[model samples]
Target chain A: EGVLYVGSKTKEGVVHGVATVAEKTKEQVTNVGGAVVTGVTAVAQKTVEGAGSIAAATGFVKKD
Target chain B: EGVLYVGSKTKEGVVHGVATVAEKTKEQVTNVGGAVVTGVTAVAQKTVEGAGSIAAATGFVKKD
Candidate 1:
């Protein structure tokens, strides 16, 4: 579903969980066919991108 | 205002057409010389990813 999938973790580098997309806030997320989920509040349409999700997305920044 | 632009359609998988950026989401599109579109609901900055846009951007991919 993405170029490079990343997992969830804590600030001190602890694996907390993963970004479980709850629900799409807009049409883009839906159109993108992003996997869906529920119980999303602050998240956009259940797009659960927690600390780990962000870390995963930005992982590409490291340039390995 | 950034680097390396990708078509909105190429996003995830579904076309969803464009990113549907907001009225002020023109920094990247305009700066990168991309055309504009309206009526974006789910898109982020009204950026579409139709075959046209994708094909166009592809021209720049792989460093040609």
Candidate 2:
């Protein structure tokens, strides 16, 4: 039930967030029945890195 | 042009990722013309944390 929609004019960083989420979902599904679920978790972790980069570039998130 | 759609059966961690992205976008827009754009960046950073937590919990990502 969760969804994020960005207009065509959104910045590249914001766009990257969208892409990361998509990639994570795909990875999760691709490995759903596989022996290594840990791999899926790793993909999810990338989502975070991607998000952080977007935030850093857009200035929405700050590092302490 | 970026969007992520998750079905109702998805896990809570994945759902959180969706929520974080939405929040970041909203914050970015709300502070678009404000003198402080840095605040918006902070929100984006949370997206990463949220995503990382999801990945860690699901075992898709591992810390080195």
Candidate 3:
């Protein structure tokens, strides 16, 4: 179970930010930073949510 | 003076992350998110430093 979880969870949604930022800059960088900032903000939010799920799945989050 | 500061300061070091991620990802994305993460981490650090600078410049950081 642990092995399977580790195999996929780590990679899921992990590359979205990089891909988004990387592609946008080619078109224009002078105005492209905003894209990076927005993308990072979204990534951070997603990662934080996933972290909460991991804690729950691992029983790290106690009901008490 | 204040107008000039706002015009450039916000744009400085902003797009670096996007351009970096975009160019690197063209070659690859499966491993490229790492770059995005690293870039954001760097940006965050720089932003914190810049925030401090703004505060100091505005007399917000008073030292006895």
Candidate 4:
């Protein structure tokens, strides 16, 4: 199982946040950082979640 | 600023969890995985939070 969250500055110069969860045999999660973007990604062997607003951000990643 | 969480199997064969938050000019967070542990890490350019209770865990990491 996997959980994910992402926040980023949009093209319109606004902050956006997204969260996701997934379960599968094997999984991969990725995030791009900038503009105070926070994100999380996790997989069967791992799980991740993050939060970001403005120029400050937060993130987490894990696997087993 | 930085936030971090860690969950791991202890020598007593039990799951242990820890959470931390830090405020600094620059910061770094790190986690080691196994035994279904979940974790999160964030820095001044970022912040992070995570949760884990068993072999299957969750995590997040973010930075701006």
Give each model's whole-structure lDDT.
0.21, 0.21, 0.22, 0.27
lDDT of 1 by residue, A1-64 (tens): 2322222222221111122133333211112222222111111122233332321111011112
lDDT score, candidate 2, position B37: 12
Per-residue CA lDDT of model 4 for A11-44, tens digit only, reads 2221123323333323233222332222221111
Residue A29 C-alpha lDDT in model 2: 14
Prediction 3 TM-score vs. true: 0.17
lDDT of 2 by residue, A1-64 (tens): 3335222221222111111123222222111111111111111211333332222112132334
C-alpha lDDT of residue B34 in model 1: 28
lDDT of 2 by residue, B1-64 (tens): 2334212221222211111222222121112111111111211112333432232112133234
What clash count goes with each model?
22, 12, 2, 21
DockQ, all models: 0.03, 0.06, 0.05, 0.04
- Which candidate has the top score in DockQ? 2
Compare the candidates by TM-score and give the number of the best one: 3
lDDT string, candidate 3, B1-64, tens digits: 0111111111112322333344433232222111233321222211121221211111012134
Model 2, residue A33: distance off in Å is 20
Ranking by TM-score: 3, 4, 2, 1
If you score just chain A, what TM-score does every candidate get?
A: 0.14, 0.14, 0.15, 0.22
Indicate the worst ten consecutive residues by lDDT in candidate 4 chain A.
A7-16
Number of the predicted model whose lDDT against the real structure is largest: 4
Q: Give the TM-score of candidate 2.
A: 0.14
Regions of candidate 1 where Cα sits further than 4 Å from its true position: A1-44, A47-55, A58-64, B1-40, B43-64
lDDT preference between candidates 1 and 3, better one: 3
